[PDB]
Amino acid sequence: GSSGSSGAPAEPAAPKSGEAETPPKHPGVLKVEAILEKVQGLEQAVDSFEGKKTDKKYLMIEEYLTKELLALDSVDPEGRADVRQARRDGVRKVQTILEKLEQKASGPSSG
C-alpha cells in the first residue's frame, strides 16, 4: 500500500416534521450513517491499534468492523442513490479500516 488517510466530517442532522423549508433527512441513509457513526469508533481503535492478525484484540476489532458491514449491507436501498452511495461509502469505509487493521497488526507505516 501507499499512504491512506482522508475524510470530511461535515453532515447536518435535524430530523423533524416541519412543513415547508428544507426537507427531512432520508431514513435509508441515516440507517447507514447510524452504523458509520459507530465504525468511526472501531476506526479510532485501528489508528491506535497494535498487535497482529492473530491476536485476539485484533479479532475483536476485526469482528466489530465486519459487524458494521453486515449492518451496512442489511440496508436495502432498493434503488436510491442517496442510500446506495451511503452504503457503498459506509461499506467502502469500514473495508478500508479492515485493510488498515490487518496492516496495523502486521506493523504500522506513516512518517
Swiss-Prot record:
There is a cross-link at K52 (Glycyl lysine isopeptide (Lys-Gly) (interchain with G-Cter in SUMO2)). It is found in: Nucleus; Cytoplasm. Transmembrane segments: none annotated. Residues 28-105 form the BAG domain. There is a cross-link at K52 (Glycyl lysine isopeptide (Lys-Gly) (interchain with G-Cter in SUMO1)). Forms a ternary complex with HSPA1A/HSP70 and HSPB8, serving as scaffold subunit. Component of the chaperone-assisted selective autophagy (CASA) complex consisting of BAG3, HSPA8/HSC70, HSPB8 and STUB1/CHIP. Binds to the ATPase domain of HSP70 chaperones. Interacts with BCL2. Interacts with phospholipase C-gamma proteins. Interacts with DNAJB1 and DNAJB6. Interacts (via BAG domain) with HSF1; this interaction occurs in normal and heat-shocked cells. Interacts with HSPA8/HSC70 (via NBD), HSPA1A (via NBD) and HSPA1B (via NBD). Interacts (via WW domain 1) with SYNPO2 (via PPPY motif). Co-chaperone and adapter protein that connects different classes of molecular chaperones including heat shock proteins 70 (HSP70s), e.g. HSPA1A/HSP70 or HSPA8/HSC70, and small heat shock proteins (sHSPs), e.g. HSPB8. Acts as a nucleotide-exchange factor (NEF) promoting the release of ADP from HSP70s, thereby triggering client protein release. Nucleotide release is mediated via BAG3 binding to the nucleotide-binding domain (NBD) of HSP70s, whereas client release is mediated via its binding to the substrate-binding domain (SBD). Has anti-apoptotic activity. The BAG domain interacts with the nucleotide-binding domain (NBD) of HSP70s and is essential for the nucleotide-exchange factor activity. This is BAG family molecular chaperone regulator 3. It comes from Mus musculus. The gene is Bag3.
